[PDB]
RNA sequence: GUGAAGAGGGAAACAACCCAGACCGCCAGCUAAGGUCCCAAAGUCAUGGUUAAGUGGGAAACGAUGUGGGAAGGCCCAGACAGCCAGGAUGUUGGCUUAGAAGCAGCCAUCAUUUAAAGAAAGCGUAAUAGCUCACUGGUCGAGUCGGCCUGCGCGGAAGA
RNA sequence: CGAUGUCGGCUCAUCACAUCCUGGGGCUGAAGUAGGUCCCAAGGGUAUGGCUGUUCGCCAUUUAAAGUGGUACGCGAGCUGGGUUUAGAACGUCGUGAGACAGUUCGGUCCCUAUCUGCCGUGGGCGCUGGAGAACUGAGGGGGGCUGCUCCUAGUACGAGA
RNA sequence: UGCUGAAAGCAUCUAAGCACGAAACUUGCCCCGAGAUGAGUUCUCCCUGACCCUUUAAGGGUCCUGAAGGAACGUUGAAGA
């Protein structure tokens, strides 16, 4: 998956695309096109 | 299980039917005699106590001799403990023979190393050496820098330095066990274990594989 | 106990006659090689007109060394002078066609079965 | 809480049982206890339960909801029960069941042995077809899952373990 | 203006910041800045709210159904939102720009019928078919649902010996 | 400025992680073998040489890898003295000249018996509540923590095949 | 990477609940280690006379006693400046 401080755009690469709130970052779940993951974040410190 | 305590004899080989030579450390033990049994009641563990050998009267102070009293069995040369595997169960003054490694593929030994003094950076951490010319000054077998600069100005706890060398507490691990021989009191495995012949060792089965 | 810099003669008839060890293979820092192990040379000196050249560079085994080989009884074997066989770099198999000089049956390696047949003596 | 606020009907068999916050609930087919979430207040009149926040907690109604369906379906499984099939696909896959292990044999070097808990129960009708069946939702999807893990379709032929409803999308090698 | 040439109190430590200008003595009292759970002198004070990030106790463009308050609006029992059942038809296998083309690439236009709606298309895919789904509408459910505005506190953005 | 010795080497190291290898994972324009790209991860490991004073770099050949950086561009009361700033000499160039160059070239003195702190070892003293001999428990501290190739599984999965 | 699962009828690995997951962490291996003044445990061994003085208190002193053991001397050591 790829990281991006912005999901504004990997959010809308497609129909299945979700954003959800896993832990504490932001993932841009899609389970059938996966290439499409994201996430906002890198972990603590 | 419980180990015992012997003594370092000295090297040989075995040779083998088919053209192998195995070399060989002799040890010896001879019955390794219980002296006290610890549970859990009475010292929050459970180990045995064990003695070996033999030692002059005139040379036994009198707290040993009560205490050797008590379990019944003659003074030895030292003392040693063994934790007990629960189940495992001896009894005062029983006696144990090496037979205990009849069936004991590999042991780890301990010994007492030999002792080499005051040795430099080279033979003890291995430092290697500068310039024996090229105009060295004074300074072929010294350590070098030991540290940095202002920051952090200190030398690091650790620093391998010069110091006593050997003269320690050593362990070595999984060697084959060749022979067992009780009516001879002999015990014999692969390979070098620490010490010089004479002193006393102690022989575990392995603890790993 | 060979090294960089090292000498070597030849027991084949590759065409070269004295080969040095620039390289002891097998190993990131790796120290020395022995008989059985791969060394890169380059040809220091030979014939007129054999496989090699002087300069080419190559891979070659060690069959002969002075420090020697220890067997499992105790025994040593050891040798006048440091020899190998020259293979080619990339199959690692024996440019030359016959060898020469008593070679060890560490050399029972599969790869270099080869050369303990044309091998006059085996110890 | 459209979700919490749906009552669920427990048939005649089902007996209901509640202590607190442990709840449990045994049918024909089993007894499965589960305990609620603090926050959840869970009240059983009429052949019904229904759920309800707790003042106090802020989060009651999605506790609640979380509850409720747990125990729709905590009812279905010791009465109705689950069942999931999965389906191996590729040359060499092949399952089997003696007692309570499914034997799965997956192109590796050793087999596979894979133990099941309490409650799963195991057939294989066809040396590539597992049915698990089970009252606890939870744990037919965990279990049905450890097995799909074992080897997960793969996208160039779809070989591997699936779940027998799954969609498995293959593709094109590279091209050259 | 302060240090310089100024002590005392605060700002952990810290000439130059805040409070404040030390003739001397006191085991009296009110204050200032700044403080009142312990180290450590004074509120574990009352009261109404936020925040769950130890944010508080480092940092931006930008990101997001975090949560608080406010004022409006759109849709909706002539049944909305989501979900699920349906269909998604005919001029037309679309003429035609390049070697296929049947919306199937690019430029041009973007007409038209049967209807409950159905785009000379929405984008996956492509030998042509394709065989997917949707855009849009009929059913089912049954009361809410949508996303802009003013604003509070927070989230991510955030790696160094 | 009543003195903090400069480049490079050698010895010796210690840290960050913006990771070179090895470990784990997401995507891949990932068939496989092998790659690309990101995420996690700092345990351990992480080249010899030809040339030049070099660091570097080019080359040769290895390796799993030959990591990036902090550390007075770590480390001269630890060593070197090859580069670079004394005095000698020359070339080129500049100047009428003396001399000059931040251009080249040949030669060209490197101290310090460790008080304190720090560190490596090693004893003395007193304590631990009458003294004494042992054997222990184990709060805590340290060390260790690298990887190659080949065999099988298997010429199997995969692949038109190689 | 997942199960179950709501807030949000759907979805959703997470909000409650739950399965996995790496040379990093804690252990497991070797060494030191009760000055661990938080000075721990166990076993054994040894000491069973009076008197004076003052500021009468865990006071000072005298006589007689002198263990267990520790050291000392000596012969030494694969232990060691
Ligand atoms: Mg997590
Ligand atoms: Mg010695
Ligand atoms: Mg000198
Ligand atoms: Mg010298
Ligand atoms: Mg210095
Ligand atoms: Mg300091
Ligand atoms: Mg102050
Ligand atoms: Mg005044
Ligand atoms: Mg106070
Ligand atoms: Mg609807
Ligand atoms: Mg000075
Ligand atoms: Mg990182
Ligand atoms: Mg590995
Ligand atoms: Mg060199
Ligand atoms: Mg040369
Ligand atoms: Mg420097
Ligand atoms: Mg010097
Ligand atoms: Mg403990």
């Given at each position: 998956m790829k990281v991006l401080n912005s999901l504004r755009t990997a959010k809308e690469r497609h129909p299945d695309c979700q954003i959800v709130k896993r832990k504490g970052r932001l993932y841009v779940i899609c389970k059938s096109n996966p290439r499409f993951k994201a996430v906002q974040g890198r972990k603590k410190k | 299980m419980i180990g015992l305590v012997g003594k370092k004899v000295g090297m040989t080989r075995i040779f083998t039917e088919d053209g192998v030579s195995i070399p060989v450390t002799v040890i010896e033990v001879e019955a390794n005699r219980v002296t006290q049994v610890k549970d859990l009641a009475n010292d929050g563990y459970r180990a045995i106590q064990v003695t070996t050998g033999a030692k002059k009267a005139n040379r036994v102070t009198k707290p040993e001799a009560g205490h050797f009293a008590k379990a019944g069995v003659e003074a030895g040369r030292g003392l040693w403990e063994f934790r007990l595997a629960e189940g495992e169960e001896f009894t005062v003054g029983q006696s144990i023979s090496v037979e205990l490694f009849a069936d004991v593929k590999k042991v780890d030994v301990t010994g007492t190393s030999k002792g080499?003094?005051?040795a430099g950076t080279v033979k003890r951490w291995n430092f290697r050496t500068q310039d024996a010319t090229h105009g060295n000054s004074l300074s072929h077998r010294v350590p070098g820098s030991i540290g940095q600069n202002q920051t952090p100005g200190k030398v690091f706890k650790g620093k391998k330095m010069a110091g006593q060398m050997g003269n320690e507490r050593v362990t070595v691990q999984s060697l084959d066990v060749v022979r067992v021989d009780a009516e001879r009191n002999l015990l014999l495995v692969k390979g070098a274990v620490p010490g010089a012949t004479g002193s006393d060792l102690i022989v575990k089965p392995a603890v790993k594989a | 106990m060979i090294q960089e810099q090292t000498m070597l003669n030849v027991a084949?008839?590759?065409?070269?006659?004295?080969?040095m060890c620039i390289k002891?293979?097998?190993?990131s820092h790796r120290r020395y090689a022995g008989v059985g192990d791969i060394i890169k040379i380059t040809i220091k000196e030979a014939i007129?007109?054999?496989?090699?050249?002087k300069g080419d560079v190559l891979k070659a085994v060690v069959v002969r060394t002075k420090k020697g080989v220890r067997r499992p009884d105790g025994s040593v074997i050891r040798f006048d002078g440091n020899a190998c066989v020259l293979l080619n770099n990339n199959s690692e198999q024996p440019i030359g066609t016959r060898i020469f000089g008593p070679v060890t049956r560490e050399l029972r390696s599969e790869k270099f079965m080869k050369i303990i047949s044309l091998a006059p003596e085996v110890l | 809480s459209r979700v919490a606020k749906a009552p669920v009907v427990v048939p005649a068999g089902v007996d209901v049982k509640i202590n607190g916050q442990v709840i449990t609930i045994k049918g024909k087919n089993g007894e499965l206890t589960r305990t609620l979430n603090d926050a959840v207040e869970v009240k059983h009149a009429d052949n019904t339960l229904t759920f309800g926040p707790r003042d106090g907690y802020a989060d009651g109604w999605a506790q609640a909801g979380t509850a409720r369906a747990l125990l729709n379906?905590?009812?279905?499984?010791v009465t109705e029960g689950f069942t999931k099939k999965l389906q191996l696909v590729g040359v060499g896959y092949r399952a089997a069941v003696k007692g309570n292990v499914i034997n799965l044999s997956l192109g590796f070097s050793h087999p596979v042995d894979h133990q099941l808990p309490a409650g799963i129960t195991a057939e294989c009708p066809t040396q590539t077809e597992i049915v698990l069946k089970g009252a606890d939702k939870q744990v037919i999807g965990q279990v049905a899952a450890d097995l799909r893990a074992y080897r997960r379709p793969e996208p160039y032929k779809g070989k591997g373990v699936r779940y027998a409803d799954e969609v498995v999308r293959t593709k094109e090698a590279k091209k050259k």
């Open positions: - | 080499k003094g005051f | 084949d008839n590759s065409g070269a006659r004295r080969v002891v293979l097998g190993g007129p007109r054999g496989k090699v050249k | 379906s905590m009812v279905i499984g």
